[PDB]
Structures are given as C-alpha cells and as structure tokens.
Amino acid sequence: SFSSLYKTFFKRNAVFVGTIFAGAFVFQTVFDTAITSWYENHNKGKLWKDVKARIAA
C-alpha cells in the first residue's frame, strides 16, 4: 500500500527538520488544547467557569 507517493516523502533531509519541528509544535498545541478541554469537561460545578451563572439570578 506504500505507493511511490509516500515513498518520495522519505528522502528529503535538509528541509525535513523544519517541517518536522513545525508538526511537533502543532501536535503539542492541539494536545494541550485537548487535555485542557478534557480536564474542563471531567469536572462541572467545582470549576470557576459556571459559578458565574450559579451566582447569577
């Protein structure tokens, strides 16, 4: 299934470092966002986001 389209992508070395670092940055950003979202939605009421509405009349 590993066609020439995917085979060609495994030969660049001078430029691959920059794009791999950018991909690592994007992955860490999305991972941080996902973990923050899961920590948010695993606990409701205790957190300070909804106490504003709880005290609201």
Partner 1 sequence: AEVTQLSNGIVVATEHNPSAHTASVGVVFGSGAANENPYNNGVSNLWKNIFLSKENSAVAAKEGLALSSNISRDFQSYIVSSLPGSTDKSLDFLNQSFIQQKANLLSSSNFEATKKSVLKQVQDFEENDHPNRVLEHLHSTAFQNTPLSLPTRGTLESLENLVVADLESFANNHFLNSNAVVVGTGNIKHEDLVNSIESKNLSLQTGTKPVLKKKAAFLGSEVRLRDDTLPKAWISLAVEGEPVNSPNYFVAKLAAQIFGSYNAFEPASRLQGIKLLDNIQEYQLCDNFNHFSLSYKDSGLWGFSTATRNVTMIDDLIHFTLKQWNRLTISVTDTEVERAKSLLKLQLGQLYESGNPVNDANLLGAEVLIKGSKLSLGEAFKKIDAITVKDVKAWAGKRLWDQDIAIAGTGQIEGLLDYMRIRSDMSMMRW
Partner 2 sequence: KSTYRTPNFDDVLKENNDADKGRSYAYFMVGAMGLLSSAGAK
Binding site for ligand PCF (CB under 6 A): 10-11, 13, 16-17, 20
Per partner kind, with CB cut-offs from 5 to 8 A, the member of ligand PCF, partner 1, partner 2, none near residue 7 is: partner 2
User: In terms of CB distance, is 22 or 47 closer to partner 2?
Assistant: 22
3: left (phi over 0), alpha (psi -120 to 50) or beta: beta
The full DSSP string for 8-55 is GGGS--TTHHHHHHHHHHHHHHHHHHHHHHHHHHT--SSSSTTHHHHH
Q: How far is the CB of 13 from partner 1 (least distance, A)?
A: 4
Q: In the set 5, 14, 55, 57, which binds partner 1 (CB under 8 A)? A: 14
